[PDB]
């Protein structure tokens, strides 16, 4: 049939997010926070 | 743990060696070849009288013979309060010797595993599966989310990737976060899911043979020579035992009391 | 022990029942006739589970069969932390049952006696001689200040006053103040001069049969009843064990943890 | 609705007085329960009338003294119906009847509340230390099977009666205590012997159990740790039943001064059947 893929997990990926945090700015996180993210908006732009 | 506040100017206390020798027990695990080469059998009494000179009361020393390293690895119960494991080394026993040293030197928290039904993961870097028995031959098969094995057929056991064969004791690490199906000889070998907590203060391993080869930590990078992994060269078991007796202050100093609120009752040779 | 100053307006601390259940071991010493009537062998596991329902961990309960009262009397070793001794009553074993109960329920500080050479007094009210073995027969001969026997020729053993025979255990008390020459069957029985300290609160004895007959105190005048000497009627050993399991809260509440600096190593079943 | 919540205020000075009256009967009734052995040894049959006459001088009117004969301890333990007000039960001690005497004492000396147990259809449990099960009938072979959380019998297979554990076999009366908090499946011969879930209320103080024979063995409390001596757990020393009855008659004032008529029930049953 298919071996579709293996998929990363929390244990493998939390260190990636730790190492990904430092690129995050703060002058526009406020704007993103102010914009109301609904079920549509938050998942609209996942990997295209 | 609740805080404990102490000064940096309080005077050092007195030596606690006499108190610990009077209150504690020492216990030596040696291979049968030790007694065989000694060619005696009043020697336990002789060594007890010898320890008494340094200050271990008469009943405080317990000599627990074990057949050999691999056969001792299965279910090692350390019936004591200070444990010394003399451990002779021969080539090709490197990994099993290291396994036993890791097992006893490191503290563990283990839970049962039901191989027949569940697919099991590994929590992380401190998690392993330890299999003990007369003969363990674990065969693992990793899976997808759709339960289609990679490099193996989940229904056929031949395709499975063997990671240990015919071993009395096997500490298997596998890739963390991937479900595995296991095949291990349930009648003979019992396998348990364990987490490696901090160290065990109670046990010291005196390697008797060759190079500093023990690697307790499965991580390839760190190979730290912990203090309780002692080593000594040898030709005569009598010389080995005399060395241990004469330096027994240093050995128990290297060790320390065990601090863990256990949950598995078992026999102890306390006073 | 230093003074322990303490208030009277301190608040009651929380109940320690869960902690003692989680960090202690219960120790059931039952006769073999119990198992014979039970006619089972999953029953240890079933009772362990029924204890788990009450709070003890899965391994915290240790069952110990013994042949019968006298065979347990010879060398009673209590390899565990909270001791219950099931003790069936049948007539003509009253004294030996009382001897066993006294021995396990009181602490003894005591040392050997070389009967073949010396003469032994008794220091006071709390100084007995404990004889144990396959077949003990104490034969005492009191002496005088002239070291002449009275009611006994010091040479002819036939004139000695036998004060036990064929007993697997004898707590013999003699007139405290006279030098006694003893003959006792050295091969199959040992004797040790022992002194009675405070109670051994680790233990408690459940008399399974008829009326109150246990008299731990050799003194005729005092025959106290102790909380640790329980008595429960019986017709079925399942019923006895079930009552013990059901009321194990109360038995442990009756029984207090040991407190005595033992200078002699021995095997305990701890957590 | 006797207002069992509002407090009652006494006084610590005044006065020691009399009990005024109570009008539901002419007066109390004394009530002997003796075994057939007493009659056989006495070898009489005007003796009930003689004992009534000898009670009259002690100060009991004629109609107040009743006598009840029973076969023996085990045959009396089944449904012991105390039809009466001041009950004395002369129990001849006999070796190997220790637990049977204890069963009967625990049954009558204490006030019980019993519910039915339909064994065929339900599992059963025990709420707490105060809850026993009482099985009575001609032959009670109570085989239990405890079940873990998963409803798999521990030490027994629920579908195989043989594997069960026989807590008490072939008893006229059996007070069984299984561990409290674990479901059980029961098995006993429903044609002959019934069984009931009986909780223990306070004590029943109409009844005095007089052990006629040996030592003090009546352990009313199933707890091994406790073994109280109640004022109603009477014990007397006997060689002849005439001597026993004469002691009872002579000291009957004390016998009734130790008891209390208040704790009585309409029905004569030894327990409240709460269905
Ligand atoms: C892990 O893999 C091994 C590799 O085979 C499994 O061995 C198999 O074990 C089962 C029973 O445990 C054997 O079944 C047998 O079937 C025959 C009928 O063909 C029957 O007569 C026997 O009484 C028994 O039931 C099976 O033959 C055996 N495999 C081979 C190739 O012989 C092992 O069971 C696996 N572990 C687990 C936990 O499933
Ligand atoms: C500690 O050592 C010093 C020096 O030997 C001695 O004077 C002192 O008494 C010791 N303390 C105790 C508690 O024994
Ligand atoms: C303190 O006592 C309460 C009693 O209600 C109990 O629920 C609680 O578990 C106790 N605390 C601990 C740590 O056991
Ligand atoms: C006790 O007396 C017997 C009988 O003469 C004798 O055989 C035995 O050696 C004596 N034992 C001792 C310790 O004197
Ligand atoms: C109370 O009873 C006694 C019985 O001797 C009687 O003499 C007395 O009169 C009674 N009390 C009163 C107030 O009459
Ligand atoms: C009780 O056991 C007998 C045989 O052991 C069986 O025939 C009977 O059906 C059981 N009672 C019930 C209510 O199942
Ligand atoms: Ca493969
Ligand atoms: Ca290995
Ligand atoms: Ca791993
Ligand atoms: Ca390493
Ligand atoms: Ca004896
Ligand atoms: Ca004589
Ligand atoms: Ca004495
Ligand atoms: Ca006494
Ligand atoms: Ca009965
Ligand atoms: Ca069974
Ligand atoms: Ca109960
Ligand atoms: Ca009791």
Tab-separated table of N, CA, C and O and ligand atoms in Angstrom, chain B residues 95-97 99 131 164 167-171, ligand 8:
chain	number	residue	atom	x	y	z
B	95	UNK	N	30.116	-6.104	27.097
B	95	UNK	CA	28.800	-5.484	27.105
B	95	UNK	C	27.951	-5.989	28.257
B	95	UNK	O	27.251	-5.204	28.896
B	96	UNK	N	27.971	-7.292	28.531
B	96	UNK	CA	27.132	-7.805	29.609
B	96	UNK	C	27.635	-7.333	30.966
B	96	UNK	O	26.838	-7.024	31.863
B	97	UNK	N	28.954	-7.256	31.132
B	97	UNK	CA	29.511	-6.688	32.351
B	97	UNK	C	29.083	-5.239	32.520
B	97	UNK	O	28.673	-4.823	33.610
B	99	UNK	N	26.439	-3.879	31.229
B	99	UNK	CA	25.008	-3.900	31.499
B	99	UNK	C	24.741	-4.101	32.980
B	99	UNK	O	23.940	-3.380	33.581
B	131	UNK	N	15.404	-6.732	30.139
B	131	UNK	CA	14.877	-8.081	30.041
B	131	UNK	C	15.805	-9.023	30.784
B	131	UNK	O	17.008	-9.061	30.505
B	164	UNK	N	18.918	-8.505	20.764
B	164	UNK	CA	19.684	-9.280	21.727
B	164	UNK	C	19.239	-10.728	21.615
B	164	UNK	O	18.049	-10.993	21.444
B	167	UNK	N	20.556	-13.966	25.832
B	167	UNK	CA	21.206	-13.195	26.878
B	167	UNK	C	20.443	-13.350	28.182
B	167	UNK	O	19.213	-13.258	28.209
B	168	UNK	N	21.183	-13.593	29.262
B	168	UNK	CA	20.558	-13.620	30.576
B	168	UNK	C	19.966	-12.262	30.915
B	168	UNK	O	18.865	-12.174	31.469
B	169	UNK	N	20.680	-11.190	30.582
B	169	UNK	CA	20.238	-9.829	30.847
B	169	UNK	C	20.500	-8.980	29.618
B	169	UNK	O	21.585	-9.057	29.036
B	170	UNK	N	19.513	-8.177	29.226
B	170	UNK	CA	19.670	-7.269	28.092
B	170	UNK	C	18.985	-5.950	28.401
B	170	UNK	O	17.780	-5.925	28.670
B	171	UNK	N	19.750	-4.865	28.354
B	171	UNK	CA	19.234	-3.512	28.517
B	171	UNK	C	19.163	-2.916	27.120
B	171	UNK	O	20.170	-2.444	26.590
E	8	LIG	CA1	23.155	-8.214	27.837
